[PDB]
Design an enzyme around this catalytic site. Structure first.
Site, mmCIF file in Angstrom:
data_model
loop_
_atom_site.group_PDB
_atom_site.id
_atom_site.type_symbol
_atom_site.label_atom_id
_atom_site.label_comp_id
_atom_site.label_asym_id
_atom_site.label_seq_id
_atom_site.Cartn_x
_atom_site.Cartn_y
_atom_site.Cartn_z
ATOM 1 N N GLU A 135 0.817 -1.146 -0.111
ATOM 2 C CA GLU A 135 0.039 0.004 0.168
ATOM 3 C C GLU A 135 0.873 1.425 -0.149
ATOM 4 O O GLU A 135 2.019 1.216 0.624
ATOM 5 C CB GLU A 135 -0.954 -0.001 1.125
ATOM 6 C CG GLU A 135 -1.889 -1.103 1.239
ATOM 7 C CD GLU A 135 -2.856 -1.122 0.104
ATOM 8 O OE1 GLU A 135 -4.013 -0.643 0.405
ATOM 9 O OE2 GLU A 135 -2.593 -1.892 -0.670
ATOM 10 N N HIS A 187 6.561 -0.813 13.797
ATOM 11 C CA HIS A 187 5.172 -0.213 12.993
ATOM 12 C C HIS A 187 5.527 1.278 12.811
ATOM 13 O O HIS A 187 5.149 2.132 13.550
ATOM 14 C CB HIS A 187 4.016 -0.277 14.043
ATOM 15 C CG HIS A 187 2.585 -0.334 13.407
ATOM 16 N ND1 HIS A 187 2.059 0.946 13.259
ATOM 17 C CD2 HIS A 187 1.918 -1.055 12.875
ATOM 18 C CE1 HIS A 187 0.989 0.819 12.915
ATOM 19 N NE2 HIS A 187 0.748 -0.346 12.464
#
Ligand code: SF4
Ligand code: MG
Ligand code: MG
Ligand code: MG
Ligand code: MG
Ligand code: MG
Ligand code: MG
Ligand code: MG
Ligand code: MG
Ligand code: MG
Ligand code: MG
Ligand code: MG
Ligand code: MG
Ligand code: MG
Ligand code: MG
Ligand code: MG
Ligand code: MG
Ligand code: MG
Ligand code: MG
Ligand code: MG
Ligand code: MG
Ligand code: MG
Ligand code: MG
Ligand code: MG
Ligand code: MG
Ligand code: MG
Ligand code: MG
Ligand code: MG
Ligand code: MG
EC number: 3.1.-.-
Lengths: 208, 151, 125, 84, 84
Positions: free
Chosen positions: D46, D83
């Site tokens: 993405e 993350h």
RNA sequence: CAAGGAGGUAAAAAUGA
RNA sequence: CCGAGGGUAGGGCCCGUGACUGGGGCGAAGUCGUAACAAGGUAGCUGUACCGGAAGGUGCGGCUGGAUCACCUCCUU
RNA sequence: UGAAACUCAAAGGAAUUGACGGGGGCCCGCACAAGCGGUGGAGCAUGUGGUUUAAUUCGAAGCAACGCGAAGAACCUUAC
RNA sequence: AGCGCCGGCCAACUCCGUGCCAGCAGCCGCGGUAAUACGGAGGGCGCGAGCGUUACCCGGAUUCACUGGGCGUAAAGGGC
């Protein structure tokens, strides 16, 4: 053909003794006195409550494996009994009990229904004078089911007849142990035989 | 003396700042298989309490079932909200032809053979209330002339 | 509606429509592959799903899924199109039956090998 | 296609060796699929927004992300740990 | 600076990773000395000629060496194994 | 003592990983 | 004489296809803004007309699927 | 007047419990206002980020991580 | 003597391998370290000279409602 293989597993799974072997059944080596739990690796795990489908499936499978019959002949007898006058379950057991191999087992010519099926298939059983080697022959009232005159002097046939010497047969049957013959007097009513199956659950099982 | 069968046990949820704070509800049905059936709905924070509360409510809430040899005397169909139930009397030897919830109610009432059908909304709570009010509305030939006597 | 209104206009019947037009009312249909590749799935899933564009007998040129692990399909492969949709891939409304013309069955499978077209292995049994 | 390692990327790639090796094998699996189709394929590719804007991210695990960038002839890796 | 791997480069760097333990980290401290001292240090630093136009090499085991060239803030790696 | 119908409204402030 | 069919000319309906072009849907956490949901910071929605990168803004009329939940401007102790 | 291909595994109605409001009514806390002394500017101490390094061991990351684990790193401690 | 299945619907559970890969799939969905849902094995369930899959019809579908539905706000009162 019919079910061939381990038979104690069938009674152990249903949780009730179905008496599918003969003398080994009233023995202490019966294995339902030894291990009264379902077979497999998860036998001694605790019973999760069965569904309504499991209840009906279990009692239908139980009644079917008592008589040792396939499931199309079972279901064909079932709608044979439903498209029939009278009470569908009681008729059903009357047509199941009218099978030649079952009348041979009940008359004590055999220790088991599977032995009865073999003895009928091998022509040792005669119906009204003539041979019937088909274990699905619907016996009608008044028929005299006997033993062949070639098979009268058989070690297995006599030992089972001398074992049946003294025991009573059902009210819908007659037995002449000395003549090696018997008669189908009437169709068994439902009070006459008390097998551990609730006939209503198998009716409402096949009613999908 | 009374055979009590659980039918629906669900987990609900109540929101407050922090997350869900749950509560369980249990619908149970009781019977003697001789003309007497009752149904209760108990909700407690956990199911053993819930089924105990429901059974306590179920034996309070009970009904007359005028069985005739194996079945209901006449067919009845009652709408409870959006849920509707059909009862039809059957001849001896057909079985309890019903779903999950009227089957558990009718066989604990003592019904041998009956024909049912669930129409409309099939939520187990309101179908159960519909069958109970349907079992409550069953009249015999005795009650029919006792009311049409005029006296 | 009223009874007169049902005498006049009546009722409409359901009008079912097929999910499989390329087979043209046939259970299976033979086709020749033309592009054999790997595509990736839809909304909450991730993999490299193997499909093949097959121009088949009824003049349609459709895409079909290659089920199982590993295949022998290239641009000039003859295959039979079975039927059945793949939820995670767009436009793939068909499947390729294995164990046919040029689509050999999956090797080393032993559980459910009537599907995926694998023969019965006999290791002294 | 060339592979470019940052030092933040290279220290974390060598942190994944010595500690959790299945993660270096997943990283190798993502780079091998990125080498053929850079914006398609495994690990949910993405395009990123608000700070990584101009970078892409392939998830290695449910926490860790492979942030990359690509030109006509090269493949630079920004991170292979945490993350973002 | 940064590490730049070619296509044979990393794949055979991945060959040593799938094959043997001491090879790859010996490879990696050579990378570590090479980033601090680009032209001198551990395992045979040498510029060579006639094959290499301005490219350098270093030792792992005398069968396999480490060919590399260094630019502004870049470290390109040409090969991970043996000569020719 | 108690209310209803009527009428003049906050500012300039966007986004979400 | 009629006549299968063949030839010429003109129409109707349906199908495939076409440089380009218009919207739709899917893969989608790309770029731009903040229109709507809380008086969503100008109550919202609507028919219509005009305009504007874009949601949209505005004119006229309509609806409650919003608002008298505080001082203070027009009429009552 | 009025479709279809295609696409989706829902789209919805009322009601409940919360949360939120640049909605309201009532009410608290050095929350604001009134008042004193400070930090941010200088020098130094200590911790952190970053960078460098053979190694600058590791953790803590808004409030509620940053003289915090250290209520004692010269070799010990000490994991680099 | 074989075939399907063993997350729920739906009878039948454990270990190992794999690890948002390979893959399953009718719906909900499962797989990014213990997966009863992938692959294998043991064990189990359902049938059995068969067992599954695809295509089509009816059923469930009172989701075209004659038996047997609805139209304030869920799709639905024509502007009068
Ligand atoms: S009764 Fe007979 S068939 Fe049943 S478990 Fe015992 S021995 Fe086996
Ligand atoms: Mg009604
Ligand atoms: Mg997934
Ligand atoms: Mg502004
Ligand atoms: Mg002509
Ligand atoms: Mg706004
Ligand atoms: Mg304004
Ligand atoms: Mg507004
Ligand atoms: Mg307007
Ligand atoms: Mg304007
Ligand atoms: Mg207006
Ligand atoms: Mg008006
Ligand atoms: Mg039009
Ligand atoms: Mg102050
Ligand atoms: Mg200072
Ligand atoms: Mg200290
Ligand atoms: Mg089950
Ligand atoms: Mg499978
Ligand atoms: Mg595992
Ligand atoms: Mg499954
Ligand atoms: Mg047969
Ligand atoms: Mg199908
Ligand atoms: Mg119908
Ligand atoms: Mg009607
Ligand atoms: Mg309706
Ligand atoms: Mg609406
Ligand atoms: Mg409406
Ligand atoms: Mg009107
Ligand atoms: Mg009009």
């Amino acid at each position: 053909g019919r079910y061939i293989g381990p038979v104690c597993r069938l009674c152990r799974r249903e949780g009730v003794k179905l008496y599918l072997k003969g003398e080994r059944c009233y023995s202490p080596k019966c294995a339902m006195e030894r291990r009264p739990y379902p077979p497999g690796q998860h036998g001694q795990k605790r019973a999760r409550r069965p569904s309504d489908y499991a209840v009906r499936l279990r009692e239908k499978q139980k009644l079917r494996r008592i008589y040792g019959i396939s499931e199309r002949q079972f279901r064909n007898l079932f709608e044979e009994a439903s498209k029939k006058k009278g009470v569908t379950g009681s008729v059903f057991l009357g047509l199941l009990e009218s099978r030649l191999d079952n009348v041979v087992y009940r008359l004590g010519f055999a220790v088991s229904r599977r032995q009865a099926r073999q003895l009928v298939r091998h022509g040792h059983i005669t119906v009204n004078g003539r041979r019937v080697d088909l274990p699905s022959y619907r016996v009608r009232p008044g028929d005299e089911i006997a033993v062949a005159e070639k098979s009268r002097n058989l070690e297995l046939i006599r030992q089972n007849l001398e074992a049946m010497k003294g025991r009573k047969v059902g009210p819908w049957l007659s037995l002449d142990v000395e003549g090696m013959k018997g008669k189908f007097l009437r169709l068994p009513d439902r009070e006459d035989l008390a097998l551990p199956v609730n006939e209503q659950l198998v009716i409402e099982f096949y009613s999908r | 003396d009374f055979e009590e069968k659980m039918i629906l046990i669900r987990r609900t949820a109540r929101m407050q700042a922090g997350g869900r704070r749950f509560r369980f509800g249990a619908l149970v049905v009781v019977g003697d298989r001789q003309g007497r059936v009752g149904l209760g709905f108990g909700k407690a924070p956990e199911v053993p309490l819930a089924v105990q509360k429901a059974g306590y409510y179920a034996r309070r809430n009970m009904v007359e079932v005028p069985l005739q040899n194996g079945t209901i005397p006449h067919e009845i169909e009652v709408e409870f909200g959006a849920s509707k139930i059909v009862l039809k009397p059957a001849a001896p030897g057909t079985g309890v032809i019903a779903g999950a919830v009227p089957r558990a109610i009718l066989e604990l009432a003592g019904v041998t053979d009956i024909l049912t059908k669930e129409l409309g909304s099939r939520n187990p709570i309101n179908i159960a209330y519909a069958t109970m009010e349907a079992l409550r509305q069953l009249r015999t030939k005795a009650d029919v002339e006792r009311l049409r006597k005029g006296e | 509606p009223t009874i007169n209104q049902l005498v006049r206009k009546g009722r409409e019947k359901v009008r079912k429509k097929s999910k499989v037009p390329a087979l043209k009312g046939a259970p299976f249909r033979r086709g020749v592959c033309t592009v054999v590749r790997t595509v990736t799935p839809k909304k909450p899933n991730s993999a490299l799903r193997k499909v093949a564009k097959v121009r088949l007998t009824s003049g349609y040129e459709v895409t079909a899924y290659i089920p199982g692990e590993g295949h022998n399909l290239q641009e000039h492969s003859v295959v039979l199109i079975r039927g059945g949709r793949v939820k995670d891939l767009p436009g793939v409304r068909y499947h390729i039956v294995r164990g046919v013309y040029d689509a050999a069955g999956v090797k080393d499978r032993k559980k459910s090998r009537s599907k995926y077209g694998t023969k019965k292995p006999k290791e002294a049994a | 296609m060339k592979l470019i390692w940052s030092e933040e990327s290279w220290d974390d790639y060598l942190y994944w060796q010595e500690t959790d090796k299945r993660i270096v094998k997943k990283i190798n699996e993502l780079i091998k699929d990125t080498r053929r189709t850079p914006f398609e394929g495994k690990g949910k590719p993405e395009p990123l927004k608000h700070n990584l804007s101009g970078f892409w991210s392939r998830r290695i695990t449910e926490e860790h992300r492979l942030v990359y960038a690509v030109t006509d002839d090269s493949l630079l890796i920004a991170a292979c740990r945490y993350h973002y």
